[PDB]
């Protein structure tokens, strides 16, 4: 069914929004519809898939898109997963609200492969924590 809409938004859909969507489906429920947008997209990032799938959250079925004001303006909520992304809110009437975080893009983490992967693990854990707080606190 449908009852609310939550629309993730980041500087690239491909990474942060895709993972936030997978955690939100666990922490929320059918009382909401959960999708992702971004300033841009490139694809369902293999990191976003494997990071969620290692938690048992098979986001392989998801897809990326760039922002569409036609869903944004109807959402109960828009979640601007990084502050530089929050500029890209073309219309959020009183039917909508916004939330804000500061997540750097995990696919660009670097130092060594294990440091890049560790950064993937940190970002999923914090995004999952974010949805846990949002769900529990009703922020």
* Count of CB atoms situated within 10 Å of the CB of 127: 27
| Separation of alpha carbons 73 and 98, rounded Å | 11
| Separation of alpha carbons 127 and 139, rounded Å | 15
Q: Single out the catalytic residue among 28, 55, 71, 89.
A: 89
Asked if 48 contacts 19 with a C-beta cutoff of 8 angstroms, the reply is yes
Method: NMR
Strand partners, 86: none
DSSP state of 12: -
Closest CA to 127 of 17, 11, 12: 17
Closest CA to 44 of 23, 26, 58, 28: 58
Give the fold, CATH level 3, of 1-139.
Answer: Rossmann fold (3.40.50)
Look-up: residue for tokens 């979640």?
Answer: 79
Per-position DSSP letters for 31-94, written without gaps between them: TSEEEEEES----S-HHHHHHHHTTT--GGG-------HHHHTT-SEEEESSGGGGG--S---T
**Known catalytic residue: 89?**
yes
Helix axes 18-27, 46-53, angle to 10 degrees: 30
Q: Single out the catalytic residue among 44, 82, 86, 123.
A: 82
Q: Single out the catalytic residue among 10, 37, 67, 79.
A: 10
Look-up: residue for tokens 């992702």?
Answer: 36
**Known catalytic residue: 15?**
no
């Amino acid at each position: 069914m449908e009852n609310k809409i939550i629309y993730f938004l980041c500087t690239g859909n491909s990474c942060r929004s895709q993972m936030a969507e997978g955690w939100a489906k666990q922490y929320l429920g059918d009382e909401w519809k959960v999708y992702s947008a971004g300033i841009e997209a490139h694809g369902l990032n293999p990191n976003a898939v494997k990071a969620m799938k290692e938690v048992g959250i098979d986001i392989s079925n998801q897809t990326s898109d760039i922002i569409d004001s036609d869903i944004l303006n109807n959402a109960d909520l828009v979640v601007t997963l990084c502050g530089d992304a929050a500029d890209k809110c073309p219309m959020t009437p009183p039917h909508v609200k916004r939330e804000h975080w500061g997540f750097d893009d995990p696919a660009r983490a670097q130092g060594t492969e294990e440091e890049k992967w560790a950064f993937f693990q940190r970002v999923r854990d914090e995004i999952g924590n974010r949805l846990k707080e949002f769900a529990e606190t009703g922020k």
